[PDB]
Write a protein that binds this ligand. Structure first.
Ligand code: HEM
Ligand SMILES: [C-]#N
Length: 222
């Protein structure tokens, strides 16, 4: 079985749970305002910054290298523009860094620094979603908050260096399937993807609440 299929099958259940989380249900209802959208995007800024920083560190490591597509995929630059749009010129010291965001970042650094063979689990969870369902989220955001079709404020959901996200996603899947894979890695990667999904749900549920030792559970634990 291909890694791309294993990951899809292993995360289909938690995905349904994530899209039905309180925050996401509200989002899909067009009930999230500027305040809430800013919190999520600011958090993603931190998350992608750590994610892509770890990707850089391991770009020449075979366990991830085949998926090194910064020009087409990386979102940090886009999020920086979005932060300027939503938070202004001095967004740097204005954006929040929530407990759930902090712990997501913490796991990303552990993976990138200690278990790089699992980095693909995290890139899959975020990027492949961005390239697909993220396009639906983009439409919801535009309609709800009156964001122009030109893209300002939604650079994160826009991929200027790709002709068709659906097409690129197919390519990414195929390259994911070239990574050296053994039962050990496969088992662990699919398990880490579930954790990645959970870290996202914890974030979104933490933000929802804000809007309304190693074994110690995360502060934003469900
Ligand atoms: C408002 C809630 C959400 C909506 C509307 C949504 C919807 C979708 C849709 C329509 C697809 C494409 C399925 C297809 O036709 O093949 C998709 C794929 C995906 N989504 Fe989401 N999604 C949501 C939340 C999330 C979250 C929170 C994550 C985790 C960061 C996520 C990660 C993914 C991944 C990794 C894929 C790619 C699946 C694959 O092809 O292997 N999604 N999503
Ligand atoms: C899914 N995004």
């Amino acid at each position: 079985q291909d890694l791309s299929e294993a990951l899809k099958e292993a995360t289909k259940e938690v995905h349904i749970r994530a899209e039905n989380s309180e925050f996401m249900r509200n989002f899909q209802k067009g009930q999230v305002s500027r305040e809430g959208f800013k919190l999520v995007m600011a958090s993603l800024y931190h998350i992608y910054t750590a994610l892509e920083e770890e990707i850089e560190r391991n770009k020449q490591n075979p366990v991830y290298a085949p998926l090194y597509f910064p020009e087409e995929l990386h979102r940090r630059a886009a999020l920086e523009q979005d932060m300027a749009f939503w938070y202004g010129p001095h967004w740097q010291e204005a954006i929040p860094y929530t407990p759930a965001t902090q712990h997501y970042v913490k796991r990303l650094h552990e993976v990138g620094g200690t278990h790089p063979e699992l980095l693909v689990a995290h890139a899959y969870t975020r990027y492949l979603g961005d390239l697909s369902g993220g396009q639906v989220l983009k439409k919801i955001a535009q309609k709800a908050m009156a964001l122009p079709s030109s893209g300002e404020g939604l650079a994160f959901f826009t991929f200027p260096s790709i002709d068709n996200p659906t097409k690129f996603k197919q390519l990414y899947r195929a390259r994911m399937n070239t990574l050296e894979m053994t039962p050990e890695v496969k088992h662990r990667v699919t398990e880490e993807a579930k954790t990645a999904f959970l870290l996202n749900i914890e974030l979104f549920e933490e933000l929802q609440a804000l809007l309304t030792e190693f074994l110690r559970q995360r502060p934003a634990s469900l």
